[PDB]
């Protein structure tokens, strides 16, 4: 797929993603915080349409992500991110997508997710997270 | 004066400042790096005009500031920043302003200035710097 | 089990652990780097004994861990860490223990593991990792 790298910011305000309940995660976009202002990250688009959108609007700065988890698995012969779940100090969002394949999880005891990078073709192929204090 | 706070970025591409050879530093604006792209900071201007402008264009990313120095002292009954000097790994810029009063200096052995905050009235009243690896 | 928290150090020189191929991970001890000198951490010992010891001696500072992975699953009614693997830039150490149950993994693209905390009873019940630049 196509690689993307948002870089690091001060925090996260909103996550906009899309997914298909029979395949994997498609689009991914993040409204960051940058020193108190919203920073509208580029929308990272799937090569295909037919996903369900979802908007995760955090009560920043009092609400923040404490655990990202999900599943990687085969769709059409490609290993992709099939599902994502974001748990904050306030609520859990997800799972979005299909909960099958190999589970992964990144719980945070101390610190913050401040950025994402990865690759999207038909689905989200892989991602990484920047972390800070 | 009017307080300002740029917050933290990923480094510094350009410093614009203004000064007068008889008073002190006037205006201050920084072009930061953010995740490899230029981010043009707010231009923190003096309440008055008539200063000499100076543009310090760094060869980012190989050139970075390694020391900030200057003087604080009284102009019209106010403690202000009278002079600044920025030393990078390549060159020294300044001093700009009037080098008298009480000197100060911040050399950095490891790390980067990534942001500025402060207050400017007729002149730069005070300032602080964000540091990071 | 007995909670432990080594805190954060400068780096990792050696990991000692013990495991049994029919149960799970037992003991856990790290030799850290502290500012260029070895610092021998507390030995976190199982309540029982008979495990097989393993010494992972890294070529510090050139060799560093890039990925920790493992499995969790139930042993005698307790959900514990059954297996661990440590991938460095030089080679892969493990798996140690039994690779059955629910996998987890922490790959690092940038940064260093600099400490461990967790809990150990008869077996390693869970653990977290301090990360730094």
């Amino acid at each position: 797929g196509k690689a993307f790298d948002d870089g690091a910011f001060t925090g996260i305000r909103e996550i906009n993603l899309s997914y298909n309940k029979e395949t994997a995660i498609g689009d991914f976009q993040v409204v960051y915080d940058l020193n108190g202002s919203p920073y509208v990250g580029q929308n990272h688009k799937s090569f295909i349409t037919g996903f369900t959108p979802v908007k995760i609007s955090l009560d920043f700065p009092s609400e923040y992500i404490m655990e990202v988890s999900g599943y990687t698995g085969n769709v059409s012969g490609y290993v992709v991110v099939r599902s994502l779940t974001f748990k904050t100090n306030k609520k859990t969002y997800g799972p979005y997508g299909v909960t099958s394949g190999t589970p992964f999880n990144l719980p945070i005891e101390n610190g913050l997710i401040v950025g994402f990078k990865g690759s999207i073709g038909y689905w989200l192929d892989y991602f990484s997270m920047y972390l800070s204090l | 004066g009017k307080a300002f706070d740029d917050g933290a970025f990923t480094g510094i591409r350009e410093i614009n400042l203004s000064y007068n050879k008889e008073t002190a530093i006037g205006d201050f604006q920084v072009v930061y790096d953010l995740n490899g792209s230029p981010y043009v900071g707010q231009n923190h201007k003096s309440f008055i005009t008539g200063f000499t402008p100076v543009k310090i264009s760094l060869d980012f990313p190989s050139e970075y500031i390694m020391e900030v120095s200057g003087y604080t002292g009284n102009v019209s009954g106010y403690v202000v920043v009278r002079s600044l000097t920025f030393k990078t790994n390549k060159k020294t810029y300044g001093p700009y302003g009037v080098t008298s009063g009480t000197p100060f200096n911040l050399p950095i052995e490891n790390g980067l200035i990534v942001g500025f905050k402060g207050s400017i009235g007729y002149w730069l009243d005070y300032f602080s710097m964000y540091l990071s690896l | 089990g007995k909670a432990f928290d080594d805190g954060a150090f400068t780096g990792i020189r050696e990991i000692n652990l013990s495991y049994n191929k029919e149960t799970a991970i037992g003991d856990f001890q790290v030799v850290y780097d502290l500012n260029g000198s070895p610092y021998v951490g507390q030995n976190h010992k199982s309540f029982i004994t008979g495990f097989t010891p393993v010494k992972i001696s890294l070529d510090f500072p050139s060799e560093y861990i890039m990925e920790v992975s493992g499995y969790t699953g139930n042993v005698s009614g307790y959900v514990v860490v059954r297996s661990l693997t440590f991938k460095t830039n030089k080679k892969t150490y493990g798996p140690y223990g039994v690779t059955s149950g629910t996998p987890f993994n922490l790959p690092i693209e940038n940064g260093l593991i600099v400490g461990f905390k967790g809990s150990i009873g008869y077996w390693l019940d869970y653990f977290s990792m301090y990360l730094s630049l």
């Binding site: 690091a8 990144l106 990865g118 990484s128 | 990923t10 980012f60 970075y64 | -």
Partner: peptide, 16 residues
């Protein structure tokens, strides 16, 4: 030793 700040990054998860 450059003028670019850096940050911890964990991952990736997903395809190799």
């Amino acid at each position: 030793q450059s003028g670019i700040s850096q940050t911890v990054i964990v991952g990736p998860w997903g395809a190799k």
